[model samples]
Structure formats: C-alpha cells, structure tokens
Target: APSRKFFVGGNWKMNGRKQSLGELIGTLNAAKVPADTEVVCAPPTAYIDFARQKLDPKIAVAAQNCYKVTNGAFTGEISPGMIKDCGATWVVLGHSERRHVFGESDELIGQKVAHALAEGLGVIACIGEKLDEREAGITEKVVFEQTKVIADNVKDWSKVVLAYEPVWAIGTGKTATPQQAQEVHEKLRGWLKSNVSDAVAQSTRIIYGGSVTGATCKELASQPDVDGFLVGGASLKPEFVDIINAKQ
Candidate 1:
C-alpha cells in the first residue's frame, strides 16, 4: 500500500575507496529523485561519516553491520550506538553474506536487531532462502523461521525493513521474477499478520534485494508487496539514479 512509502537502500558492502565513493555521493547528491521515496545508503563501515557528510541530507546513510552491544572489546565491530554517533540513522543486519560467509547465527542477528533499535537506528533485517533451500521446497519454512527470530527481537516495526534477498540472486546477476518475489512477500506478510498484528504487516516495508539493477528495478518496484530495494552492485554505478526513480 502507499502507506508504507517507498524505501530504497544502497548496500555498498565491503567495496569502495574514499575518492571514487565521493563521486558516487556527488552524483546522488545532485540526482533528481522523487521526494516521497526514502533513500538510505550503506557504504563500507569506514566510509560511514564520509558518506553522511557528502550525501545530500535527502539521502541518508546506513552502517552495513554493527555489534549487538552498546560498547565492547569486540575489536572488529562497532556498536550501534557508535553508528548513531557517526551520523548514520540505520544499520543493515542479518545480510546473507554476514550469515553464510561470516557465519553469523540467527540468534546473534536477532540480538543485533534488538540493540540497533534500542540505540535508535532503523534496521534492515534480511532473510532469504538459498538456491538449494528454494529448490528443496522449503522457501517459506526457511524465510518464516528467519523472520520469526528477527521479529521476536523487534521492539519497533517502524524502525525495521524486512529485505527478502534470495541467495541465488544476490551478487549473481539473477533476480527473482516479480511474480516469484511477490508470492514470498505476501507469505511473509501473512505470517506477520497472524503472528504480529494486521497493522504491523500492513505498515511495514518489505523490500527486495539481490542483483537489482536499473533495467530491472521498475518491474520489481511494480510488485504490490515489494516496497523498495536494498541494492548492491548497481549502487556503485550511475544507473542508481534510474533505480531511485523506478517507482515514479
């Protein structure tokens, strides 16, 4: 529904250099995009402040990952509280790479979701079925289980956006067809409707991720349940302007 608004996020992942990223920010700063669309960009953690300072305030910044605790000796990680201090109002949690590649657990992701919101950052909590999981016929079971843990830790729905990024699609040039994407989105909403509340299900934004590109954005954006995107590779390119305008 229009009530959810259009939310777009650019996850730069672990890629970028200060100078090149500045050009990307410069482009986004000047691009003419719809005012109604909510845009957020997650650069590599080190670039959080740089992205925030360089990006026009119309486009906000997000931290790709954050530790669950407010502060800790988890030397490799920055806490969500510190993320807020860095001028980022959002954080991407439970991204598939953080799951499969880095070996982060569901419980830890849930914990991170809890603390991020507590520290006043919105959460992009991700969940997806891998190719094998989808092929094995347990897409719903896998996503529902992931959402359950994520939802359980959410103290606030408005601060969270659920991104359904099929593992087969992310970074692989494969995108779920709109029909394929919508079905799972509807199923997740139904799960939310029953387990959470009708309002939360209706009001929350459920975005799609995985191989999203300018040419592909419009059709995916057209889906009724696909509120927006958590774009990856395309995010570093100029076509991201087209992606931001896809809804309009």
Candidate 2:
C-alpha cells in the first residue's frame, strides 16, 4: 500500500431525523478525528444543504446517490450538479441497498460514477459480493467484474475511493471476520495492480464497509490492504467518533 490517508466514511443510509441529525453532526464536529483520518459523511440528498451549513469545516458531506445524467427530466433523482450546488464534496455510488433493493445494474452505476466525476464531485464507489456469490466461490470474480465496470467507464480515478462492502453483512450484524475481509481486500488490491496501473493499485484507498462498529474497526484497519471504512448503522451514534479515532 502507498501513502494514502486513512478514510472513514459515514453512510447514514436511510436513518436520520431532525434531532438525530443535529446531535450526530454536533458530536462529530466536537470529536477529535485522527489527524491522518479523512472523514466524510453521506446523508440523504434532502439533508445536504443543511449539513453544509452546519457541519465542521474538516468534515465533508456526500450524497448517497446521484443520477447518471447531469441534468434532464429525472424526477426524484439527484444530479451531480445538484450535489455540487448543495456544497457536497462526495457521492456514494453502488451501495448494496441500491444494487439489491433498487436493482441498479453495474452499467447504471458506472454511468453515475462517470457523471459524478465529470461534475467534480468525489466518489465513494462501492463494490462487493453477495453471500451466495461468496458461498459459491465467485466472490473474487464478482468483485473483479464490477471493478472493471468502473475502470472501463471512468478514466480518471483520482477522486474515487473504493469501498468493499459485502452485502450479507450490511446491517445484518454479521460482520465478516477480519481474516475474511483481509483476504478479499488483498485479492482486490492485487487485481487492481494487474488490471489498473501499479500506481493506482498502491495509492488508491480500498476501505471496508458493512455492519462496522468501533469494536471491529481497529483490527480491520490493521489489515495491510484495508485502508479504512465506510460505516453504516453505527455511523449515526457517538461511537462513530470512536471509529474515526480507530487509527489513533
């Protein structure tokens, strides 16, 4: 691994309210995130403006989803231009929920990623296998194929953070053991080295996601290829502050 900074992303998912959002934001602003940690929190598009106005300067805001096109007649779909307008610096694409629940094809995610990058918004591009895929011994193949989709669609990968989030463990409280996660991450890094350039393979941050809690972060963060995390359920609580300090 190269000298990429450790990243901790809070994927608020579909959980947050007026009071809860305020409290979480307050805690994160007051918390002392590790000096080396690159922290970003993705909230629903509805909250981007409010978050921009209130979040700490060091904390970045991201959108959970964005449309493939910059602008048009897409109702209920957020555009990258809109995200920038709201002062969000990043957008999370290809989350497991979007893939499984909404049936977002890899092609669609590729388009969304490209569009986001074109608009100058950083991306937290997620890729992972389902339980059945892992059980059937196709985890590497599945993840590799998805990675190719983004690699093929998007030319510039500088502003992108790759998040490896296995679907089964997302919100299931069935976090993948450190060994399992490390194996997949190691293989993913190797694939990047071979398929992409060695520079990208070594420098890009490949963070883990799915049911991550503070108790599970430090050990996983120690993995050679596991650069950081994209936290979900636990990201909404004060413990998220602790997870941000995992490297400390």
Candidate 3:
C-alpha cells in the first residue's frame, strides 16, 4: 500500500529451447507494459545472457537459481556474482521447486539470499507452504519460518522481492483464491512490520506465484497487498503481457 513498484517476475524454469525462447523474448520486447511495473524474466541459468541480450532494456533478466559462494569447486553450481556477470540483475531463490524438489534447505537458501544481495543482485526470495502443510493449518507457521530465514540473511530489503508461491498451486493449474492470496500477502506484511521493520512492511513488494492466468491476474492485482506476480507457464506465452499489465 506504500506504492511499492509492482514487480512481475517470469520464471521460465527448465522449459523452452533457445530458438523458441528467442521468439518469446521478441513478443515481450515489442509489448508496452505499465510504467510503474517492474518486469523481470528469468530463463534457465544456462540462458541468462541470451535472455538479457534478446530482451528490451525495460525488461530485466533474472536467474532461476544460484549458489551462495563465488568461484566454488561445486559442480553444476553458479554464484550470484556469476549471475550478475551474465547480465541478469536478479535471481529467484528458495523457490518451492528448489526447496521441495531439489532439497535446498532453509539454511542453504538463507546463505544464497545473503550472498546474492551482497553480490549486488536483486533477489526474488520465494516462501510458501505445501498443500499438506496448508491442510494441516500451519500455513502461517511454514511461511513465516521461511520468511524469517530469508529476512535474516538480507542485508538490504530494497534489493529483494518476496514471492509467496504456495507449492500445491505451482504448475498444478490450481491457484489460491484472491482472498486466500490477499490473506497471506497481508499477513506477510504484518509479519515484516513486527519482526523486521515498519518500512519493510510498508514498502516491500509482495508478489504471488502459481497458476496466474491473464484473467486471474486482474483480480489478484486488485488486492491491496498483492503488489504483482511471479509468472510461471504463462510467462512463456504471449499473454504474459496481460499479466505484466494486470493492474491496468
């Protein structure tokens, strides 16, 4: 509610090949998004530079994931500094896929968040609960814990966007109702107010993820704390511009 710039992030995940992604970038490049909205498209790490090169300057590039350490011996890992060098100004860390599918712990994600921020790359730090956890009625507990860990590692909140992506909704075609999303987003802000700082609660851009369609985005965007989105499958399609322009 404090006029945080609307932040829309497109997570291409492991999908799309170079030629097809080139076409996708062309579609975004030619579009006109809202003036106050911040748009970042994250292709897979392998294509960060390609996406950056193909995209218009208005649209930033982000990495789907990155490592905590720079120039490490770890195989199949990339550091935040390396991501910045590739021209991606942002990274998505602690995504549900990264946490649940790849077994990235809170400790690991915290480290990555801190290191990424330290390396001067903006971070889209994702926090969420699985369907089972929600069913167990511990959604706040789960999300707050995740947020706390990420908050602990962030040296500057301005360089981070909080993405609340409920796991069951991700890639499953089921989205949290607008009320559900607003509830979580509102609570997340409150948590920040109490635990972090009032400025962070008021200024942080709290975006949503999971099954965000063009139709769904409009309603979701209307919610007070629903600052923007972290688009998934739709980001690969032309209609993703609709999500980018959701508020209008």
Candidate 4:
C-alpha cells in the first residue's frame, strides 16, 4: 500500500497498575474499535508478556524499549529477541524521555531502530524539539535533523512510525494548535520525500503526540499529515478508546 492506515499507539509509559491492565484491555476489546485503524499499545517492558496474555488477541502489544543487541552483558536492558520471544510485535524507540532524561543520543536511537526493524518489530520512532527550540524557530531544523539520522541508518520504512512530539506540549497542557502541528507534519513529509524515497514518504504513518486529549484529538485528526496519535496521559484514561476510534 502506498499509504498506511491511521495508527494509534497508547504509550502507557511508566504508568498503569497490573491489577488494572486487565480491565483496561477488557474495556478496549469490548469497544468497537475501527476496523481500519492499527491500534498498538506500548506498555512497560515488565507488562509486555502480561499484556499479550490478557489483552485481546486483536490488540497488538509493544515493548516500551529494547536494547540494540539481541543478547549482551548490558544489565537492566530488554533485548529485541526477548520482546519477540515474549510475544511483543512492536517496540518504541527514541522517545523524548529516553533521549533527554536518560541521555540517549540520536545516534543511539538510530541503532535501536536498526535493531528493531531487523527483528521485524514495528517501531514507533519519536522525534521532537524542546520549548526553547520551538520558540527559537528551530523546530523544523531539529526534527529534520533527527529524521535524517534515522533515514540514513534504518533500511526499511515499512515497520516504522514517526511521532512528532514537541517537548513543551508533552505534559505541560500547552497543546500545539492544529495549524502549528500541521505545518510541521507537512514539512516532515516533504523532508521524507527529499531524503528518503517519495514512496516511503507517502507510505509511512507519521503520528502526533504531546498533550493529546480526547478534546484536542479531533481537530488534530482532521489534519491531512497526522495519521493518528501516540497518546501519553490521556491514553491511560477511558478517553483512550475514543482516540483509538477517532476515524469512525
């Protein structure tokens, strides 16, 4: 297909209680999610196996993070093989938290993308800028740089999903106006065409994250460049189901 379906990802992140995951998944399974939507949920690594077992068969689970090496002496790291072995079909790489908080550089994130795609795992490759960068009029520059790095390293775009999450908007309650987000998304698409193949630009699904809410999602969903969302805070609530079924 030249275009990908709208893909909604729930980055459960470090939240979610084990006792509540079942009910959450149950609620999702019970809801009538759109047939055409590709719903992917990224739970913490500790919950991947459990989510696979308890979550509905139709709902695909993803590991929040995976080490580049399949097996190594790296302690406190989850490997792609282990995630695949445990029934995870996807993995999230290069989230802002991983990059800024944990000090993961763009080069390191590219390595993870190469590894995850190599393992046939769907990747949610996150790239965004901070408030200062955006304020300084460098949002496009930063996002473009990050995208180029990934494009240079990753061989395939089939399993990759790019998430545009401005750090300022993430949990600060300062949402990006629809126009602001669309401008960046459209630019990202253009960059894809220039750096990668035009086919990859048309086919890849680029989703928006950062301060996404059920209220704000509809307007953003109305944009052409935004395929769907990689929800953070709101995804943990009942509104997640609404975000997933936005296309309907």
Off by over 4 Å in 4: none
Candidate 3 lands at a TM-score of 0.98
Model 3: how far residue 205 lies from native, Å: 0.5
- Tell me the deviation in Å of residue 16 in model 1: 1.1
Q: Estimate each model's TM-score.
A: 0.98, 0.97, 0.98, 0.97
Which digits, one per residue and each the tens of the lDDT, describe model 1 over residues 124-211?
9999999899999899899999999999999889889999999999987688988999999999999999999999999999999888
Pairs that collide in candidate 4 are none
| RMSD (Cα, Å) of model 4 | 1.0
Error of 4 at 141 (Å): 1.3
- Runs with alpha carbons beyond 4 Å of true place in candidate 1: none
lDDT by residue (1-248, candidate 4, tens digit) is 94569889888888877878878887887877787688888887788998998888778899988888899999999988898998989998889999999999998998999988889998989999997998899988899999988787779888888999888888866978899889999999999998888899898899998888888878888899998998998878898888887865
**Predicted candidate 2 versus true structure: per-residue lDDT over 107-153, tens digit per residue:** 99999999899999999899999979989989988999999997787
lDDT agreement with native, every candidate: 0.91, 0.89, 0.91, 0.87
lDDT of 2 at 93: 95
Worst 10 residues of 3 by lDDT: 1-10
